[PDB]
Amino acid sequence: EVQLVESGGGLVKAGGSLRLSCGVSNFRISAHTMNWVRRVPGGGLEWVASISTSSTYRDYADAVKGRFTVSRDDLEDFVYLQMHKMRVEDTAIYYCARKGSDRLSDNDPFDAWGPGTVVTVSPASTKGPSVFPLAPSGTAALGCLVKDYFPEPVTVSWNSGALTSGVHTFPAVLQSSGLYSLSSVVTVPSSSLGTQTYICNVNHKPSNTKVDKKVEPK
Amino acid sequence: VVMTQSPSTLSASVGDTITITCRASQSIETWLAWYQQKPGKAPKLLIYKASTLKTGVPSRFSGSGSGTEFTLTISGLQFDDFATYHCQHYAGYSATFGQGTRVEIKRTVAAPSVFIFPPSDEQLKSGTASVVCLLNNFYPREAKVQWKVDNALQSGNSQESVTEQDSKDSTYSLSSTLTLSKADYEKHKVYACEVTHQGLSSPVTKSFNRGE
Numbered sequence: 001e002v003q004l005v006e007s008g009g010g011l012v013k014a015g016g017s018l019r020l021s022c023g024v025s026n027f028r029i030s031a032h033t034m035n036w037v038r039r040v041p042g043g044g045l046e047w048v049a050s051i052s053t054s055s056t057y058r059d060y061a062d063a064v065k066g067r068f069t070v071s072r073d074d075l076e077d078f079v080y081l082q083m084h085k086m087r088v089e090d091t092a093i094y095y096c097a098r099k100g101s102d103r104l105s106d107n108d109p110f111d112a113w114g115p116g117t118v119v120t121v122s123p124a125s126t127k128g129p130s131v132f133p134l135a136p137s138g139t140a141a142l143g144c145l146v147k148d149y150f151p152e153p154v155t156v157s158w159n160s161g162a163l164t165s166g167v168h169t170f171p172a173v174l175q176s177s178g179l180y181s182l183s184s185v186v187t188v189p190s191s192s193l194g195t196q197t198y199i200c201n202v203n204h205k206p207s208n209t210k211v212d213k214k215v216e217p218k
Numbered sequence: 219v220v221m222t223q224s225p226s227t228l229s230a231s232v233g234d235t236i237t238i239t240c241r242a243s244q245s246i247e248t249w250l251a252w253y254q255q256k257p258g259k260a261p262k263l264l265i266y267k268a269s270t271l272k273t274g275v276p277s278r279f280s281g282s283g284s285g286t287e288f289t290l291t292i293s294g295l296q297f298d299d300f301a302t303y304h305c306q307h308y309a310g311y312s313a314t315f316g317q318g319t320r321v322e323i324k325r326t327v328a329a330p331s332v333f334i335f336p337p338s339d340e341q342l343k344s345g346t347a348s349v350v351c352l353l354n355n356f357y358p359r360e361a362k363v364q365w366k367v368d369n370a371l372q373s374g375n376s377q378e379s380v381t382e383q384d385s386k387d388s389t390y391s392l393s394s395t396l397t398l399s400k401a402d403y404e405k406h407k408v409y410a411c412e413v414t415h416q417g418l419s420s421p422v423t424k425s426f427n428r429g430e
């Protein structure tokens with residue numbers, strides 16, 4: 001089957017540069033107009049740029065005009081998106097998509113897409129999280145607050161994986177400071193609060209930080 | 219051209235007939251496509267030229283309309299159809315998309331279980347206090363969390379995060395975090411989270427007094 005692979009995603013400082021690439025499997029790009037699309041955190045789609053066959057026409061969205069450059073290499077079957085003067089608002093999943101149909105016409109839909117690459121534009125630097133307990137007051141709850149870290153992601157386990165039932169790790173929230181924050185919670189019986197031990201295990205691979213935090217009533 | 223999709227969220231059960239509308243700001247003839255997308259996955263083309271079904275797509279998917287009004291109908295929704303659907307106006311060298319419609323699994327109304335968490339003494343030394351409110355295993359997704367500090371309503375100092383619909387029980391969980399400076403936190407005594415949801419006949423307020 002036809003496959004498209006985006007690469008080159010990652011972290012960029014606000015005002016920096018990054019080049020995305022899109023490669024393929026089981027087809028040649030030469031007869032296809034190729035496009036870049038991005039999924040904004042909402043999560044709708046936004047057309048970014050298009051490059052026609054032979055690089056004759058290059059069209060860009062108003063939000064990216066003059067800052068983004070689309071290019072293609074038909075011999076090797078690669079499409080590029082060179083991004084300059086990157087803004088925090090360029091943070092998104094970027095997809096490469098082929099314009100096509102069973103029989104090629106002057107105006108076809110996007111018949112094949114890649115799975116996307118995450119692009120995160122931020123003035124922040126690698127920062128390990130602070131790990132605070134969420135202490136309990138029939139059924140009770142306890143947790144861990146994982147705050148002021150960068151970049152995403154962070155892993156959270158309870159009692160080294162022994163406690164999985166009733167576990168909820170929330171999606172991270174972007175704070176005004178440009179650092180992420182997340183909570184992980186577990187529902188447990190009120191009677192077990194003084195008897196059972198509850199330990200949250202936090203892992204942040206980018207800063208090589210592993211934290212074990214015991215959660216007890218205050 | 220501006221594409222507007224309605225509704226933004228659609229609740230449904232297996233076997234239901236559902237409809238998604240796309241309205242264009244100006245006439246686009248039949249230059250419209252519909253895509254399906256699952257979280258963290260590539261979009262998939264379903265229908266193009268407003269009503270042509272892509273080869274391989276199940277016949278329960280149908281597209282209709284022209285000019286400024288378009289509809290995507292799923293006749294007999296199947297388990298694999300719970301996803302986000304996007305409409306697109308496509309031209310020779312550009313395209314525009316609607317905002318997307320998420321189709322979610324319908325289940326019986328379930329009230330949230332509510333818990334409040336005070337900030338830790340350890341956090342106060344950092345100069346900030348985070349008060350957390352947890353709303354556990356509820357349905358539908360709509361819920362209102364109101365923060366009260368000394369019986370006064372808070373605004374703009376809280377952020378919410380919601381889990382994806384649970385694969386086992388089709389419920390949602392939500393965390394609401396109220397962030398205050400150490401000075402503002404220590405200035406007040408009673409901290410409360412007041413929750414309202416369809417599953418409740420009375421509002422649920424969880425509270426604590428700083429310093430117990």
Ligand SMILES: OC[C@H]1O[C@H](O[C@H]2[C@@H](O)[C@H](O)[C@@H](CO)O[C@@H]2O)[C@@H](O)[C@@H](O)[C@@H]1O
Pocket residue numbers: 030031032033034052053098099100101104105106107108109310311
């Ligand atoms: O973007 C327009 C068009 O570009 C590509 O097709 C080109 C060419 O390869 C085709 O043979 C002719 C046939 O009409 O059209 C273009 O010149 C494809 O990307 C096509 O899907 C797209 O609509």
